[PDB]
Amino acid sequence: PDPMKNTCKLLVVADHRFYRYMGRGEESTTTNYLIELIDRVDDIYRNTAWDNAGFKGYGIQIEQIRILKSPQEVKPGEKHYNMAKSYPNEEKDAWDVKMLLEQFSFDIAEEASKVCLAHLFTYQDFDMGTLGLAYGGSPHGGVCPKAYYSPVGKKNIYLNSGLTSTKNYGKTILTKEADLVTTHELGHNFGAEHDPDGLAECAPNEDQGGKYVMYPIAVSGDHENNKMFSQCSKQSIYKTIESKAQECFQERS
Ligand SMILES: CC(C)C[C@H](CC(=O)NO)C(=O)N[C@H](C(=O)N[C@@H](C)C(=O)NCCN)C(C)(C)C
């Protein structure tokens, strides 16, 4: 490992929904929540030996927190990830998750080009229990801005993005649950795909420590494996880190 290039610096964005419901309309409350969540997530990453030996000490740190206090004013037919209304169906509490991640990536493009990753934190009840989404580890994108020309957007967007919602089934999720959502989404950004049932080593039974963080079904941080990366995730992420740390990782602050 290169200690000068072992940290993925993040642009963290709190939308108006997050500011109102998680921040309780306060900047200090909003930032403290995020600083603490990223730091606990960083502990999981930093302590992971990607090759099961000495390839450890890789993590994440916040470079900047953008705090959107109020909804983004939009012109008719114009959409923005921070607008007041949900898209495509305004009658719903939440956006369609895939459309939201695409919109966030479009709006944050200039800022995303300058950071290892951009992450959106929101407060909306995505349909059917979805908690987040991210580019990378899909069956392109993830760590280090990779341009994608959007035919719809008519401009380059960067695929170094992800999002976390702390609202699910009409309530705020536990902090131990939110930590796991962000760890999983950043896991995709770091190159990991979902752990498959077909590989017992990567998807253990409840009496064998339970599921790892990359399992497609949400885990409550009460089982032994829930806050850890599987050997499947480690193999995928090890390859990403090897290829990507020299490109955009920085020295730990
Ligand atoms: C932190 C979790 C692992 C992220 C995944 C989505 C995902 O893979 N994002 O990258 C999820 O939201 N999963 C939901 C999940 O497991 N949500 C739980 C909290 C839930 O609501 N379960 C109820 C089952 N009807 C699904 C979409 C599978 C329902």
Ligand SMILES: [Zn+2]
């Ligand atoms: Zn996933």
